[PDB]
Amino acid sequence: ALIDNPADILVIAAYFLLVIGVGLWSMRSMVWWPVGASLFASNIGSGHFVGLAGTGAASGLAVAGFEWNALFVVLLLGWLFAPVYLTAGVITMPQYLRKRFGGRRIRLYLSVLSLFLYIFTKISVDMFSGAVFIQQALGWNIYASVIALLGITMIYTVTGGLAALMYTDTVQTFVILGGACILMGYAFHEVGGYSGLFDKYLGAATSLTVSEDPAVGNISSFCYRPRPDSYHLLRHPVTGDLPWPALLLGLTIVSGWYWCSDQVIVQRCLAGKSLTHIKAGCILCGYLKLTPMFLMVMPGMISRILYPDEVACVVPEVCRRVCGTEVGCSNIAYPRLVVKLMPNGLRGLMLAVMLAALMSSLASIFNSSSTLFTMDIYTRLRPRAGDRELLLVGRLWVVFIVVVSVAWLPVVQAAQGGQLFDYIQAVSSYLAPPVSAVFVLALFVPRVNEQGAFWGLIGGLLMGLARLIPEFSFGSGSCVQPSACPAFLCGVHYLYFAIVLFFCSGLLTLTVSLCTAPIPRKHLHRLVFSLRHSKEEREDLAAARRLEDISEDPSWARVVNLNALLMMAVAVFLWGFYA
Template identity: 55%
Template sequence: WSLLVRTGDLAALGAVGGYEGLVERYPLALPPNVTGPCGRPRPDAFHLLRHPSTGDLPWPGLLLGLGIISAWYWCTDQVIVQRCLAGRSLTHVRAGCVVCGYLKVLPMFLMVLPGMAARVLFPEVVGCADAQGCRRACGTPVGCSNVAYPRLVLTLLPPGLRGLMLAVVLAALMSSLASIFASAGALFTLDVYQRLRPRAGARHLLIAGRLWIVAMVGLSLAWLPVVEAARGGQLFDYIQAVASYLAPPVAAVFFLAVFVPRVNEPGAFWGLLGGLGLGLARLVPEFALGTGTCGSPGRCPPLVCGLHYLHFAALLFLATGLIVIGVSLCYPPIPRQHLHRLVFSLRNSREPRIDLDRQIPKDGAGDVQLQEDPEPTPPPRPRPSPSLPDVEAEPSGQGAGPVPQGAGPSGERGVAEPPAPPPEEGVWGRVVDANALVLMAVAFFLWGYFA
């Protein structure tokens, strides 16, 4: 896939004379009959850090807002988390993240520069300036930037490679959609439907998950006209705008839950609810009234839609954090015995952790209370295995015996004995660390070069 995409990118850059030719010709890529500012290439097109107020991607929002969205995606999104949890060891998980970091460097050269080359090669289509011209060029009055890559493929690649490229793009799209819909089905089935129908069997849950996926597909198809009309038809801006309105509350709750032990469940719940409400207060009127395009302002009032969506993401993150902390201070804190190795300040704790959800009925009325641990009773010694390291025996009043991992002093479920640190593969662990440093150096160099 990478080889095919790279072939198309080389063809696009070669057609405009390489990177030097792109820098020289891009400012001159004007559509026909341009009289006003609309349709003209931005003078800061080759700079990542742009003006904080007039830039289309202002640098404070790019650093803060986009950083928050990235933290949400890489740390909490189900698509990423389910892959990390499938890793054989911590070294494998870290290596996978480093490889993904290397791949994340490529979009600058696989997507951005070829798109700019398409603007140079087809200015009357990709750079159309008015609604009538865009409708004639691609059938969409809001803009034709989304047809840049297909136009490059159909124009520059030979017939056999066109079909192969189409198959590659569709395969990648199907893989991404399958992962997203599978995650959505699992979340709905396990976190919502199973709570409503606790006695549902495995086949029942499987059917419910599939029906939910079908409903999600139908909702996605019904939402396509909104995607086409939002943000001037620019798909990347639309994706980042939606994430800016919905992702910061999740990122704020995750950040505070890891670094602030005082945060509790009511604070997290009301923080998510309040953040979602604030995000929808911006998302709904913007998509309902429209933000407009160059030369055609939208109907959304500046008081609601005037702030750039990346700046709004940073403010939404702060507002959600204040709600989480404020509500958490109104409720008792989570006892320390439930937080060992779950928060950053207790990450190296060796004390047993009691599961917060370990409860038993208190009386016939259905009230619950935490179950107290009985006196330690040594369980049978487990058979050593490569995945379960042996545990030294500890003397007790009745004799000596080990305590296996995952069990408390009584060997009961719910009391997590401090686990041994996950084994690191010495040589490969150092290789991963070295590659992480190289990746950071490459990222800093690219930022410095294009800033």
């Protein structure tokens, strides 16, 4: 409906032709900048656009801390976790845990858990975001949009558009950043510039605030007005929607799982030619992670300014007519800005950019999940599996998880307040912190053994489920309709719960490990951070040596370290600037 003009159809078709042509033409080596671009492209998908813009429209600046916190955890990956992964000679994170602790249950459990996390927070989220973009562009329902997105994804995979070339994610990162820059320029032009956004945001509210539902009736000002601390990154510890202690500590835990314990990102970073290239790509990715504040969040705030009756709908029936979700319609923030603000031709370009972000993230996720199932689940049951059956099983597993994610999609649309990023980060905060705790204790506390690790993972799963299940079962509330969560189980912010779950999992891990037999030191050479440069042979629980070498020349190591310090100082300045 909105891309029905010849210019939009032409630009979309040109992008599809280029993608199909490059995919059909396809018929440890990466240097630092491909590594950084790959990390950024794998991380940033259409879910990031939808969620960051929606939370910026709904709440303001603080959501940028979800991307700005990633600089420090990417430096953790480059300087603490990547060395250990490279010296351990691992291809999957469950494989590292298998080397570190032994046994076969931690690897299997972590594979299954990671696949569930990909279905929940990664695949279904991206499918939902693409469907929302198709809804705004074509005026379709959510299910026609999902079917269309599945069809185009099937075309992408059949034509081979998800194949990984040497500089594919570099081009994807360039296209994402260029499209986001064009839309950011148009959006800032609409509001009268950078200062126009901050002039206008706090006054932008919908004029439709009375509901015909007698239970709702007059909706309070607190529910439709922009938050008073909308321009502040650091918000109140108990009343803030993103309290600063939770945004700085629990978000560090969740981001640490995301960047240092997760196959999607680590599989990209482990392709670096050297450790200096991995560290420099970490610096580049961290610098690129400062961009979603101005390319996603502030455009979402501008979207609230421009379309307050749609993006900031408060009345449940008005919201149901706007986006189909009665609890809020902020997810259409970036979609609407693409279709209502971009002119003919550039609107199709922005749709192509969103599809490119979606497809780069999906390529990373599909590769990682197929690898996980193939090497950590399937090959355990079929050790004699040939390459052909492994490849076929991987493709079929990818198809299976895509179907399962589409099945899960109703939960994703039932995000709390109708905010996708809240759903992503809450599920991450309920399921990830046990993995963060176990990976940290594995890397840095050699006394932790297989018993402590596995039972910390299981106990963390139990304690995080005692939060996840009531959160979903009680339904999706909003400010207008708050839902019947007991408010001791859901009143606490999910990043505070990430802190609590991380510390409870670490405590259970340490306590079970200290009550059982320790792992002898000879089994932990080059597996713990304490023994990266250990040259002894280890009892596992030429070319390979060059694969497992993390010795870097002092000059470029010093240059990379100084650039990491400079990037941290720039990030700290930005944190203070918007504090």
